[PDB]
Amino acid sequence: LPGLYFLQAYPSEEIWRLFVDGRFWSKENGWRGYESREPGSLNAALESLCSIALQVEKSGEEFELSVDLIKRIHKKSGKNPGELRTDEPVSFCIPAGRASIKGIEEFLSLVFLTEGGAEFGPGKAGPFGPRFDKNYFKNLNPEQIPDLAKQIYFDMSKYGHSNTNHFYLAVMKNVDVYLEKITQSYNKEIKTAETLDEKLKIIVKHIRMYEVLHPFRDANGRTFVNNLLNILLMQQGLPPATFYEPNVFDLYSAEELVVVVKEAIFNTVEIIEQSKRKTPITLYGYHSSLEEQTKFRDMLDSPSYEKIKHMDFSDLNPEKLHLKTQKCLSSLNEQYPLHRGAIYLSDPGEIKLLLSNRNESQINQQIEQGAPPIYVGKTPAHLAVISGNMAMLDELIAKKADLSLQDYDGKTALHYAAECGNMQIMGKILKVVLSQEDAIKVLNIKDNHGKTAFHYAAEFGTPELISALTTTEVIQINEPDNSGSSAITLAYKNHKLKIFDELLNSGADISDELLDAIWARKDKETLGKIIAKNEKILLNKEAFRIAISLGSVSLVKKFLRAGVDIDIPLTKDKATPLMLSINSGNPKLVSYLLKKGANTRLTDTSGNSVLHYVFYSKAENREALANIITEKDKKLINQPNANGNPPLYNAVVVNDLKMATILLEMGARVDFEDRLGNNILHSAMRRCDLPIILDIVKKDSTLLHKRNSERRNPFHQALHEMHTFPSSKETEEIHFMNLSDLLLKEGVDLNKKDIKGKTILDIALSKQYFHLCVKLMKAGAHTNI
Amino acid sequence: PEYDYLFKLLLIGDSGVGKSCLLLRFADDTYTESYISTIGVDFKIRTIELDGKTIKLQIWDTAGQSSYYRGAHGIIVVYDVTDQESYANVKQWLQEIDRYASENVNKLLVGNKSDLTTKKVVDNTTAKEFADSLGIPFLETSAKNATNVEQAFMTMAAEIKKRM
Ligand SMILES: Nc1nc2c(ncn2[C@@H]2O[C@H](COP(=O)(O)OP(=O)(O)O)[C@@H](O)[C@H]2O)c(=O)[nH]1
Ligand SMILES: [Mg+2]
DSSP states (O other), X not given: OOOOHHHHHSOGGGOGGGTSOHHHHTTTTTTHHHHHHSTTHHHHHHHHHHHHHHHTTSSOTTOXXXXXXXXXXXXXXXXXXXXXOSSOOOEEEOOGGGBOHHHHHHHHHOHHHHHHTOOXXXXXXXXXXXXXXXXXXXXXXXXXXXXXXXXXXXXXXXXXXXXXXXXXEOOOSOHHHHHHHHHHHHHHHHHHOOSTTHHHHHHXXXXXXHHHHOOSSSOHHHHIIIIIHHHHHHHTTOOOOOOSXXXXXXXXXXXXXXXXXXXXXXXXXXXXXXXXXXXXXXXXXXXXXXXXHHHHHTTOOOHHHHXXXXXXXXXXXXXXXXXXXXXXXXXXXXXXXXXXXXXXXXXHHHHHHHHTTOOHHHHTXXXXXXXXXXXXXXXXXHHHHHTTOHHHHHHHHHTTOOOSOOOTTOOOHHHHHHHTTOHHHHHHHHHHHHHSTTHHHHHTOBOTTOOXXXXXXXXXXXXXXXXXXXXXOOOOSSOBOSSOOBHHHHHHHTTOHHHHHHHHHTTOOOOHHHHHHHHHHTOHHHHHHHHHHHOOOSSOHHHHHHHHHTOOHHHHHHHHHHTOOTTOOOXXXXXXXXXXXXXXXXXXXXXXXXXXXOOSSOOOTTOOOHHHHGGGSOXXXXXXXXXXXXXHOOOOSOOOTTTOOOHHHHHHHTTOHHHHHHHHHTTOOOOOOOTTOOOHHHHHTTSSXXXXXXHHHHHHSOOOOOSSSOTTHHHHHHHOOSOOSTTHHHHHHHHHHXXXXXXXXXXXXOBOSTTSOBHHHHHHHHTOTTTHHHHHHHHTOOOOO | XXXXXXXXXXXXXXXXXXXXXXXXXXXXXXXXXXXXXXXXXXXXXXXXXXXXXXXXXXXXXXXXXXXXXXXXXXXXXXXXXXXXXXXXXXXXXXXXXXXXXXXXXXXXXEEEOTTOGGGOOSOHHHHHHHHHHTTOOEEEOOTTTOTTHHHHHHHHHHHHXXXX
C-alpha cells in the first residue's frame, strides 16, 4: 500500500534525522540535544512512526484517512492524552521568520478561525495564556485582508525576524466538528487529485489546517507533521520528509509549503544517495564523529522499526520509484540555485561552473519572504558560512561577494562564522573584511539581538578564535548587547572557561550583571580569580556583598585588606556587612567581623538589630549565631523602632520555640509592644501553638488588650477564620488549655471587634462552641449584644 | 512514595511583591534582601503534615518570561501592601484564572511586606472586604518577619484538601 522502501533503505546508523530538526544538528551535536531534552523521546517518536507503519499495512482495505487513527498516532506519542480538546485554551508564539505575506492571507481567509473566535495578533506572554494588545479576528473585513497581511508582517518583522511579538490561541469550541469536516474534505480532494504534484498540494493544504486547528492538548506537531505527513508521503511512493524547520505549517501559504516538503523530500533522498556512495555526510553543517555514531547503535532500541528492516521488498522494483521522485524534485533547481548550491554542493568543478558569469545583483541576492524559512534574508555567503561549505565560500570570495550585508535577523557572514565556530572559514572572511576601507565598521556591526560578531565568538568558540578577533584591534570588547550582557559575561554563563580566562587576562572592564550570575551559581573561586587578576574590584560594593553573603572568611579578608569601612551600608535597606554575614554562610565570618570591631548596634532601614537578622537564617544555624552575637553586645532588648518588637517576636512568628525559649532564658524583657498595640502574647496566641511557653511568659508580666481586640485569646479566634473541620476538634481543644489559664487571670471580657463583635459572638460564628461557648458562659463571660 | 496528596501550588502577582521571598521563607526557611533567582529553578517543594496526613507541596514561582502552569490545584495571588498598583492589578490576575484555569481551583489573596507598617498604603479591611466579596480567604504576610508565611500555605493546603 504505502511504498516505505526509503525507511528500510534509510541508513539505520543515521535514521535519527527524521524526527530531529536540521536547525539543531549544527549546534546541538546532532541528536544529543534532543536526547538531553527528553531521553528516548525520539526512540518513542520513531516507534510511533514505525508502530503506525505496521498498523496501516496489515489492515490493507485501500486505507483512507480515519479520525480513529489520527487519535491512535497521538496514543503512540504519549485530563487524559489521545483525547480531543474541548474548551481548553492552547496558544503559542510564531516569529516573522516562520511567516509569509501570502501565508497570512490564507491564515486570515480561513473563516472557521474567525467564527470559532481564536485569539490572534500581537501582545506579550502571560503565566497561563497570552495577553493581546489587538485581535485581528473580532470584526474583520475580508477586503482589508491583503493590505492587512503586509501590515502585520511589517509588525512581526520590525520587532524581530526570529523573535516573537505575535501569539495565537486556537478555537476553543466545535473541535470534534471542525476536525471531521477536514478529515472528510481530504478524502474528497485526494479523489479529485489528477496530477502527481497536485496530490502533494492538497496533502500540505490539509495538514496545514490540521496544524492551525491545534485540537490536541500537546504534540500537535509530532502527530500531524513528523508522523501523518510522512505516512501520506510514503503511501504515494515519495520518501519521508527530513526537514530543517518543519514549524511553518501555521503561517506559510499552501503552495509555499509544497516547496518546504519537496526540500525535506530532497533532503531525505540526499541522505539515501550519500549513504550508498559511502562518502562522509555533512548536511546543515553537522559532521558525524565516530564516537557519536558508535554510541548510537548500542543505544538504538526501537524494535517495531527493526522488523520493517528485516522485511522483504524484492516484489517491488526500486527504479520504478526513482523516476517518480525526480518528477517533483526537478522544480527546486531553477529558483535560487546559488543559495541551494551553498547547502548541498562540494565539488569545486561543479561549484565554479554554477558561479560562471554571475552578475553582482545575482551574487548578493537576499531571498525575500515566502520561500522556505532557512533561505529568507540570506546571501549565498551566509548559507555557505553556516553549512561550512568552504568550497562555495572560496568561489564567492573569488567573485568579491558583499560580506558586509546582514540578513533579516541582523547577523552578517562574520556573525555566523563565530556562532558556528569554524576558525578556518572565519580566517577566509577576516582577510577579505580587513581589505575593505570600512573594515573597523563592518567588524563592529550589531544584529537585532544587539550582539556583535565578537559576542557570538565568546558565547560560542575557542580562545584561539577570540585571539584572531582581538588581534584585529577592534577595541569593542567592553560593549554590552541589548540584554546588557558583556562579551565576558556571556562567556561565563556558558561555562566557556579557557575563553573566559583569556577575556579576564585581557582585563575587560567587569560588569555588575556578571557578579549576579556568580551569585546564582554561588561560584566563590571565579570571584577569587576575578579579585586576583583585576585586583582593584574590592572597591565594588556589590562585589563585597557576594564575598560577605556566601563568600569565605578568606575572600572577605581581602576586602578589609583593601580597607573599606566595616560598617558601610551596601544594600537598598542599608544592611551592614555583619548583618549580611549572619543571613547565610560560615559563622567563622560573623566572629571575624566582630573580632575586627564590626559595630553591633546599627539598624537597617526598617530598624532591625543584627540579632533580628539571625531569624532571617535557617533555624539550624540560628542557635550558634544568636550566641556568637550576644557574647559581644548582650543588647537583645534593642528592636525595630519602626514596629518596636525585639527578636523574641521574630522567634514567635517563625514558630522556633528553641530560640523563643533560649532568648527568654537569656532574660529577654516582655515589656515591649508594637505601634498598633499588640503584645508578645498577641503573636504567641496561636503561632506558638504550645502552652508550656504561654505559662512561663504570663508568669513574668500582665497581658493587655489593645487595638479593640482583647489579649491574645480574644484576637486568637479573629485570626482563625477558616476553622478547618478535621482540626476543628483540635482548634476548640487548644483554647481549653488557653482559657483555664485565662480564667485564673480574670480576663475582663470586653467587646473584641471594631464592628461590635466580641469573644462570644465570634466563637458562635466560629462554630467551635462545643468546648468554649459553654466554658465561657459557665465562667461568667457575657453573651453577645 | 505513597505520600497522601502531593498538591501543586502556584504563586502569581505583579513582579516585586515578593513571590520568590515568600517561597524561600516557606521552603528553605530563610530570607535574603536581594533576589538569587535560584538559577531559574522555576519551582520549590515542601512536605507538611496537616490533619495527621503527610502532604507534599509542589510550589511554582512566576518568572518575567510545555504549558505546566495550568496543572496547579491552588493559586496564591500575591500583592505588595506598600504598592497600591500591585493590589489594583489583583483584579486582572483573578480574571486570568477565570480564563486559563479550572473554576474548581482554590484561590487565596496574600498581602506581602506586612513588616513595612511605616510605609503601608493598602488597607487591611478594604482588601478583606474585596476578598470576602468573592468568598476568597485573605492573609497578610512578611517573608522578612516570616509572619503568617506557614499559615498562608497551611490554609491553602487545607482549602484544597476540603474540596479535593
Ligand atoms: N521589607 C520587606 N521586603 C520584602 C519582603 N518580601 C520581599 N521583599 C523585597 O522584594 C524584593 C524582591 O522580592 P522577590 O521575591 O524577588 O519579588 P517577586 O518579583 O515577587 O519574586 C527584595 O529585594 C526584597 O527586599 C518583605 O516581607 N519585607
Ligand atoms: Mg520571581
